[PDB]
Amino acid sequence: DIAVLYFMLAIFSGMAGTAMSLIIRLELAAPGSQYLHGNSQLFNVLVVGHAVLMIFFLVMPALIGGFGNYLLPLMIGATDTAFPRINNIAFWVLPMGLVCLVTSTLVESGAGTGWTVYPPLSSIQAHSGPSVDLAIFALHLTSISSLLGAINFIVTTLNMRTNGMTMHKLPLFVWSIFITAFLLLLSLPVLSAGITMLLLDRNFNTSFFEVSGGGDPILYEHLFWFFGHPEVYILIIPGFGIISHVVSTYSKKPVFGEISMVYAMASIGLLGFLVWSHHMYIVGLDADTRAYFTSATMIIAIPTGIKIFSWLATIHGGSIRLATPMLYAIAFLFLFTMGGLTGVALANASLDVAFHDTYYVVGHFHYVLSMGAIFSLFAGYYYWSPQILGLNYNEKLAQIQFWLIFIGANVIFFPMHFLGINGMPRRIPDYPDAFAGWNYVASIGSFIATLSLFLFIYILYDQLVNGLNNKVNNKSVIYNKAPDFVESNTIFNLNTVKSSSIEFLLTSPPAVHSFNTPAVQS
Amino acid sequence: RHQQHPFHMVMPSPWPIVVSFALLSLALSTALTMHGYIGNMNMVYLALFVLLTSSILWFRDIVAEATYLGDHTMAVRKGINLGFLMFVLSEVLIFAGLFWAYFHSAMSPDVTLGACWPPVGIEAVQPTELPLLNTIILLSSGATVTYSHHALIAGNRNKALSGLLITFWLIVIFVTCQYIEYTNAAFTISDGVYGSVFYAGTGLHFLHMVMLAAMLGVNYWRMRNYHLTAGHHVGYETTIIYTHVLDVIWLFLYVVFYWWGV
C-alpha cells in the first residue's frame, strides 16, 4: 500500500541528509577550507536543510508511520488502517514539502537560520532571501501530516481491535505507537499555532515575537520547546517498541515485565510533556522554578531506566542468535544507557550553565537520537524486510554494515564530549585554532559512516537476487529438526494467520487483501 | 450465509483527490510565499477556492460512500464518533496555546509600552453593550440544540427545523455582528503585544465559523435530498453537535478577557 513509496521517499531524503552531513563535516574538518561562505549564506542554510529534512523526513515517517501503516494493522489484526483515505493524503503531502524545502534551499540568498528558527531578527530583514517562510511551510505540512497519521493510528488501534486482544496484554509495538500518537496529539497543534503566529509576524507585519511593539521572543522559546521535547519522545518510543520485539524473538520469547513495561511507557507519556524546561534552563527564570524543573527531569529519567533494566533481564537467560537485528538491539542498549547517563549529566541544575550550545550537548543528543533511532530503524528494516519484500538480505553484508556503522558513528560522536566542555560554540562555521584536533577524526568518521550508507545501498540492490544459503529462519529450532513451523506461541491464538509469534505467518510477500476471518486469543 | 468483515474499503491509491489536495497545498505554499514578496494577488484566492472545492469533492465522495452506496455500520459509527471527538481534544491544544500566550502576556507585565495591560494607548471595549449580547446569543445557541436533538429523535420535522433554523440563522446574525465589531475596533492587528493576540483569538473563531457555515450548508443540502433520517445514524449524523462544545470552550476563552483581565 502506502508503505513502499513511504519507505522510498525516506531513503531518498536520507541520502540527501547524509550528503548534507558530508558537506557540513567536510567543511568542519579544517578552518576555512572547502567553502568560502562561512556565514548564514549557504552554511546555516545547509545545517537547517540537514536537520529539518532529516528529523522530519526520516526518523519521523519511517519509525512512526511506515511500520505503522504496514505493521500496526497486521499486528493488531486489522484489515486496513481505519481511515484508508488520509494516510494517502498525508504521505502525498510529504514530498511536496520536500520540494518546498529544496526550494527554500535554492532561492537567491537563503534565510536558513537553524532548524529551531528563533524570531527576534529572523524577521523581514532576512526576507530578501525569503526561504524561511518556505522552511516553516515545509515544517507546517510535515507537522499536520504526522498529526493526520497520528489520528489514524489512534482510531485504528481503538475500533479495529481484533477479538483476540483486550487492553491488558497488548503487543509492545501496538501499544507503543498508540502511546506515540496519543502523545503526538497533545503537542502538535501548539506548534502549528506558533507557525501561524510567527508567519503572521514575518508576513503581515504585526511582529509579536520580534523586537518592536514590546514583542518578546521567550514566548516562542517556550512554545517550540513545548513541542520539541515531546517531539524527541516521538522520535524514541516506537524505537523502544521495535527493540522490545527484536530482543524478544532473537533470544527468548518470554520477555521481562509486560505490564511493568506498558506502565513505564505510560509514565513516560505522562511526565514527558511538562518538562520543556532544561533546554533553556539558562535563560534566567526563577530559582525555585528551575529547581522544580531539574527535580522533574530526574523523574522522567526513572522509567526509561526501568525499561532498560527489564530488557537487561530479558536478554539474560535466553538462546541468543546473533543475527544483524540482535546486534542492532545490543548496540542500541549499550549506547543508549550511556546517552541517558549523559542525559542525567546535562539534566542537573548548575551544569547547563556550562553546557548550553556547546558540543557536549551536541554529542549527547546525537548519541541518544542517532544511535537509538537509527539503530532501531536498522533493526526494523533488517528484521521485517524478508517478510514484506520477500527476499533474503545477505546476512554477511548486513554484519559488515553494522560493524562499519558502529565504529564510524562512535568515532564521530565520542570526541564531541571532549570538544564541548572546553567551550566550543554551537553551529560554528569557523572554530578557533585550539579545536582542530577532534574535528579531524570526526570528519574521518563521517566518511566511514557515509561509506556504510553506500554499502547499505549495495545491500538494497542485492535485495533482487534471492539468496537461499544466507538467512532463512530467525529463532532456529530447539530440539526438534524434523518438525517444521515457527516454533513459538506463548499465547494460543493459532486461529488462521495470526498467532503469538505475531505476523510472521502472513506470507512473503503478503497478499493485497489479507485477514478474511477474525482471530481470537486463548 | 455469506458474511464479511465489518470495517470497509475505499478507492485504491491511484486516486485523484489525494494527489489533488497535496499539489493544492503546494499551490497554497507558492501563493503564500510568492504574493508575500513578489506579489501575485490573484492566485492566493484561487488556492483558497480550489481548497474549498476539493474539500467539497472529497466530502461528496465520502457521503456518497455513506448513503448513496451504504457502507457504514455501528462499529465504524463508534470509530468516527470517537475519532472526531478526540479531534475536539486536539483542537483544545491549539486553543490553549493562544490562551496561554495571552495569559503570559497579561500575567507577566512588559515594562515598556503600558506596564499595566491593556497598555497606555490601547483601550479595550466595554463588555456590556455588544459582548453582553454575545455571551447570551452563544448561550442560546448552546441551549436550544439540545432540544433540537430530542426533536430529531422524536421523528417530527417542523419542530426540529424550527430549533435548527433559529439556531443557525441566528448564528449567521452572529457572523454579521462579529464582523461589525472587529470592523469598528480602533486598535488594529499591528499594535502592542495585545492587538494580534486578541485579534488572533477572535480570527480563529472567524475561520472556524466560516468553515462551520460551509459544513452546515452542505449538511442542509444533504438534508433536503432525503439523505439523513433519524434511524440513519451513518456517522455524519453524530459529528454535528460537538461545535457547540467548541463554543462552550469559546465562552471559556471569552471569560478570561472580561472578568479577570481588565
Binding site: 526550494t103 | 499551490a27 510568492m34 501575485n40 492566485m43 472545492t53 476539493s54
Partner: peptide, 29 residues
C-alpha cells in the same frame, strides 16, 4: 457527475502548472 469535474480538472491543471512557472522568477529575481 463529471461535467463539472472536467473544468475543475482544467483549473487544477493550470493551478499546478503556473507556480512551477513562478519559481524561476523566485530564484532569478
Amino acid at each position: 457527475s463529471a461535467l463539472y469535474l472536467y473544468p475543475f480538472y482544467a483549473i487544477f491543471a493550470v493551478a499546478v502548472v503556473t507556480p512551477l512557472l513562478y519559481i524561476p522568477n523566485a530564484i532569478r529575481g
